[PDB]
Design a binder for this molecule. Sequence first.
Ligand SMILES: N[C@](CS(=O)(=O)c1ccc(Oc2ccccc2)cc1)(C(=O)NO)C(F)(F)F
Ligand SMILES: [Ca+2]
Ligand SMILES: [Ca+2]
Ligand SMILES: [Ca+2]
Ligand SMILES: [Ca+2]
Ligand SMILES: [Cl-]
Ligand SMILES: [Cl-]
Ligand SMILES: [Cl-]
Ligand SMILES: [Zn+2]
Ligand SMILES: [Zn+2]
Length: 159
Amino acid sequence: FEGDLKWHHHNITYWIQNYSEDLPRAVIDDAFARAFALWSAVTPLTFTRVYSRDADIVIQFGVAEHGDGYPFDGKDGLLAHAFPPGPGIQGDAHFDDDELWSLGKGQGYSLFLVAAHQFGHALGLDHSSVPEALMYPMYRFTEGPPLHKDDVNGIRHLY
Ligand SMILES: N[C@](CS(=O)(=O)c1ccc(Oc2ccccc2)cc1)(C(=O)NO)C(F)(F)F
Ligand SMILES: [Ca+2]
Ligand SMILES: [Ca+2]
Ligand SMILES: [Ca+2]
Ligand SMILES: [Ca+2]
Ligand SMILES: [Cl-]
Ligand SMILES: [Cl-]
Ligand SMILES: [Cl-]
Ligand SMILES: [Zn+2]
Ligand SMILES: [Zn+2]
């Protein structure tokens, strides 16, 4: 997932290729939209849902081997990964459907928070060393605005 490029356009498009069997499609679509809204709220970036493989960010829920050199392991461990800006698989976000996807307090992992984190990568952001930042490499659920000052500065430094 090595990348040093940023998008050369601000009108970013995404395609929800498939869904997780843990949540209603309406809940999934809204979670992704809200995750994207976090980033557009502090930048001139916009996110438009499309239905084509030509979308910049292709969102895919997979299990085990799913098309790249980093197959998912299973329950826990790797929750998801995303490729840095660029053509093709670049910019795409993959989620391990072997995980229990949920939202808010309770068991399972928040699709909202994990997606927001992954979209950060798909925009060119690297991991943060700030434990409270959304771009921190370790998952942990908490309430309140996901974007930490460190996350806002990182994204604006790019766009
Ligand atoms: N796979 C990861 C770890 S991960 O368990 O899949 C992960 C950890 C945390 C994630 O976002 C997040 C960060 C803070 C709070 C809530 C959610 C998303 C994904 C990762 O950060 N992938 O993007 C790593 F570090 F590369 F191994
Ligand atoms: Ca904006
Ligand atoms: Ca792509
Ligand atoms: Ca896993
Ligand atoms: Ca699942
Ligand atoms: Cl599906
Ligand atoms: Cl798949
Ligand atoms: Cl949540
Ligand atoms: Zn993948
Ligand atoms: Zn990450």
